[PDB]
Amino acid sequence: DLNVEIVAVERELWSGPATFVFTRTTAGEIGILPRHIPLVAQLVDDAMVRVEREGEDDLRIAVDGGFLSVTEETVRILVENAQFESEIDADAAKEDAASDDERTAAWGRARLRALGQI
Amino acid sequence: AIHVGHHTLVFELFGMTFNGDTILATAVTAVIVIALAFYLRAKVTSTGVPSGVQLFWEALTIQMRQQIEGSIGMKIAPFVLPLSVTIFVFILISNWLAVLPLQYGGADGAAAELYKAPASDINFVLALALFVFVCYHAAGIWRRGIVGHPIKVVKGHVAFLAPINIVEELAKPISLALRLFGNIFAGGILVALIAMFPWYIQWFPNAVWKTFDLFVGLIQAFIFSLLTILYFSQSMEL
Amino acid sequence: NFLIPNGTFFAVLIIFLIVLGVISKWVVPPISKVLAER
Amino acid sequence: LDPNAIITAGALIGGGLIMGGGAIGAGIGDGIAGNALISGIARQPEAQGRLFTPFFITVGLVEAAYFINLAFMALFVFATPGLQ
Amino acid sequence: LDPNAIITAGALIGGGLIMGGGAIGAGIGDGIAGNALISGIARQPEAQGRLFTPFFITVGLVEAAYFINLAFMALFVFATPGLQ
Amino acid sequence: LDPNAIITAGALIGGGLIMGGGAIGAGIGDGIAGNALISGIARQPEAQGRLFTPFFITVGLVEAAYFINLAFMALFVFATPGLQ
Amino acid sequence: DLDPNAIITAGALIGGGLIMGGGAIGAGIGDGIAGNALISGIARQPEAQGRLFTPFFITVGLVEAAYFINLAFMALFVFATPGLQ
Amino acid sequence: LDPNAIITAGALIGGGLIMGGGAIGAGIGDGIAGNALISGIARQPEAQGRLFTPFFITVGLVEAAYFINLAFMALFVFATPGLQ
Amino acid sequence: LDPNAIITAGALIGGGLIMGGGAIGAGIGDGIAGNALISGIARQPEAQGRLFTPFFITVGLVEAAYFINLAFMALFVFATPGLQ
Amino acid sequence: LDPNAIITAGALIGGGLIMGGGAIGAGIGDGIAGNALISGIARQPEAQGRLFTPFFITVGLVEAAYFINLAFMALFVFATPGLQ
Amino acid sequence: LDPNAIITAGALIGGGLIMGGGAIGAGIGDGIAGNALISGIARQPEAQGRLFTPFFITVGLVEAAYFINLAFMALFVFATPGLQ
Amino acid sequence: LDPNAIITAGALIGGGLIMGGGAIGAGIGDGIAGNALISGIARQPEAQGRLFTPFFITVGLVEAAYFINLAFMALFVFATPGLQ
Amino acid sequence: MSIFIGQLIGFAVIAFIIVKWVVPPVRTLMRNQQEAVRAALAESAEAAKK
């Protein structure tokens, strides 16, 4: 298996084993499996991370300022900010989406994608 | 000899020839499709657990609806769904019915098939392709007028290539037909070729080719329906 | 020759047409209703 | 030796060349355009609708060449120019 | 010599050219499309199904050419235009 | 057999070669250019407006070559040079 | 004098050679391209090998099918030559 | 049979080969160079001005072969060497 | 003119076509597969065996076509069908 | 017919093949090298001088092959070896 | 006329086809393998020693087909099958 | 009818085929290798001293194939085997 | 007649292949879909009861 570490600037948010790490880099959607080759990529502005763990429900994380680093022994996602699916509130995400401010619009779109409404 | 292009049960009517074999094959395929349709209609289960036939029809309808919605709104082209699903099921049944062991010897060493895939006849593919062609051009006319649609198709997305454009507007039907016919015609020949071998060695290549031809027919039906949907979407826009 | 069309064309079309009719009446509408209800 | 026979044999060979070249070009061009389309879909799943447009723009040209060649092959064989 | 002999020799050579071109085009195009599909799935294993819809389109648009050629090859060989 | 028959057969074969090469070239070049354009639109959809200018330049070069080949095939077949 | 069947068979052999040459070129090129894709995918994501072998074999079948159709038609040309007098 | 007929048929076939090869090369080279140009434009529009220079050098190097082939085709077809 | 002479000339040209096509396909496919293997090994020092396996699959697939073509060339030029 | 007629027809067909192959090779190689150059300039604007020399080496090799083919066509056609 | 003359002409054309196809395949496959080797060297200079193994394997798999083609060309020309 | 005329025509056609194939292979392989080296130099400006070794290896293989074709075409043309 | 026997037993081989390798997967897919819809229905009933 592969160990995933979702780390924020202020603190390390999440850390644990997983089975499939989906995300959307600038080039395009990427799915990391246990022995993926080493890689460094930049997550898109409104990126989203989906961690499929062993014997557990998937974890959806909205990511802001994301960066992905695969090392064949652990996947490390460095995020300026992030929010788990449970913590994300729908109404605020809708309000902040489709905003002129590019940063808040990207954050809102990432929250929408993490929730499931896309 | 291969006896390519020969037709059995050929008759005449109203000063016109009619290859009986292809008519019979089309009739049998239509009977099969109608039987499946009425089996579904009798055994529709909106609330309770669905049947296998209901599952098959549901899967096909969902696939066609998804393709249409991706290409053009279902609210804009509802009939395209029945057209695509009927085309798909017709072609698939016609191609798959050839898998049955209906091939024998014609008493002169030339293989003869009791049932031959109707798509192997130019008339069948011509009918399907021309019907789809007329249908989608009429849909375009309805969507964007009687003179608007010809102008749009002639100019296309870029006006300066209007001459070239016309060519594909004539290639769309032909490419739709010949491809299908061609892909089936090969089968109608391949098995015949395999029929030259002695049985004790002829069985193996025939089995392999027919097994692959199952997938080939599935792919051909899917491609025909999908390209019909896409042509409908292209005709009906703006 | 084999590429030249024949009368069968019309006949084939006719058969296809009726099939489409059935597919447009007793297959697609019930299935769409079932999917919408689900 | 019927001169028309030589002329039409040459016409058949020419039509075969026309069709072989057209098929090679159409097949490889379609494969390349389809590779581009499949890569775009894989990397950008939401770009399918806006990708199908340019894909068919280029496929139009690719098949236009092929079917022009097909028409000229039909002229070669059925209406052999210069036939006596 | 019977002219029809020359007619048939030319027809067979033309059909060989047609089938060779069609096979080259179909093989290369299918290989390229399969390369696109395989690379896309390797990048995103869960994008398998979504990539089958466009793939086949390309394959269709490829195979058509070859199969179209094949059809005409039969016309050359079994019902040769210009035969005496 | 009159010489004009041999000359016409040679002209038909030459025109077939011309069209086969022109097709191959046009199909392959248009496919490659369309691949480039499709990839560009996939990465940057907003760029579709600014992408057609070089793409159509490439397509014009390719189709220009193909149509020059077509004109010379027409010269070969209809008005055969050297036809006694 | 030239036997017409001699010309028929010469043309048939030429046509079969062309058919098989085109088939071999197409099959080799397509299989090589698909195998390159498979090798790159296995290099990238080893655990996706099983998922990759499916589309790889789909493409390989689609290519070898054209190749073997060309084979069959070459056999038609060479062994039971159409139009033979 | 007049020698000139055989010479002219051979010249026509040779010119057809010349044009076919030239068109294949020109079309595919133009397509590849245009693919490079389109990708470069997609990545960065600002590069367009400086990109048009190497693109023109490439297109010139490609079309040079085509035009030399055209000239030698004209030599073959019109003033056939060794026409005696 | 011995008919067997015409038959054998046709068979030799056919076998030459067989071997030319087989060699083109084998060389190009093996080169592409080897390029894949070389790039994979360059990226990963220790991917050797796991890349050799699929590389061997591809090489076997291509060489199968090459050797089938070679065997049919041998059939063409050693037991010529239609000879008499 | 004159033996020189057959020899000259063969020479013309051979020279046509020479030019077809040379033009295909030149066009394809020039296009590929120019594609590399254009991509390099696009990604590295200031690298024009550094990239030109390798590009000129590649083009020199390609045109060396092409012009050797042209010279041997000239030998085939104007100084047909074995002529008699 | 001499039947052996037709036999040898067909043998020469067949050997020419064999060697042309072999040369095309060998050249392009070696170019592709060399492209892979160059990219590997550029990405990782330390790889230069290790890459030569897969590179040598690929070059061997290509040159093997090329030299088998050469051997069969030599068989075709110097010891022509069916040369009565 | 002089058999040597048929022999020489066949030899010239075979040499044309050999050189067309050799030129195609050489041009395309050299273009591919030059593309690889240009790209590598673009990535690593300090790689000019190291990429040249594998580049020269690849070019040596390609030109070795081309010059072997040269030698065999010279044999076919100037000293035709089977001439009688 | 001989070719009829050959094609008949070739079709027998084809049917064996279909039942051995193709019937199990399609049957599993049908079972999965039927169980999923039966679930959905029972879940709707239990949600109404809740």
Author numbering:
A (entry chain H): 3 to 120
B (entry chain a): 10 to 247
C (entry chain b): 23 to 60
D (entry chain M), E (entry chain L), F (entry chain N), H (entry chain O), I (entry chain S), J (entry chain P), ...: 3 to 86
G (entry chain T): 2 to 86
M (entry chain d): 1 to 50
Quote the original article.
The membrane domain of the mycobacterial ATP synthase is embedded in the IPM, with the catalytic F1-domain of the enzyme extending into the bacterial cytoplasm and attached to the membrane domain by a central stalk and a peripheral stalk (PS). As do other ATP synthases in eubacteria, chloroplasts, and mitochondria, the enzyme couples a proton-motive force (pmf) across the IPM generated by respiration to the synthesis in the F1-domain of the enzyme of ATP from adenosine diphosphate (ADP) and phosphate by a mechanical rotary mechanism. The mycobacterial rotor consists of a membrane-bound ring of nine c-subunits, attached to an elongated central stalk, made of single copies of the γ- and ε-subunits.
Extensive classification of the data for the mycobacterial ATP synthase revealed the presence of not only the three main states referred to as S1, S2, and S3 but also of substates within them. Substates S1a to S1e are in S1, and S3a to S3c are in S3. The main differences between the substates within each state are that the positions of the PS and F1 domains vary such that the F1-domain (including the α-helical coiled-coil of the γ-subunit) appears to pivot around the PS during the catalytic cycle. However, alignment of the substates via the “crown” in the F1-domain shows that they have identical nucleotide occupancies and that the position of the γ-subunit is also maintained. Alignment of the substates via the a-subunit demonstrates that the c9-rings and the membrane α-helices of the a-, b-, and bδ-subunits of the substates are in identical positions, as are the ε-subunits, and in some instances the lower part of the γ-subunit. Each nucleotide binding site in the three α-subunits and in subunit βTP is occupied by an ATP molecule with an accompanying Mg2+ ion, while the site in subunit βDP has ADP and an accompanying Mg2+ ion.
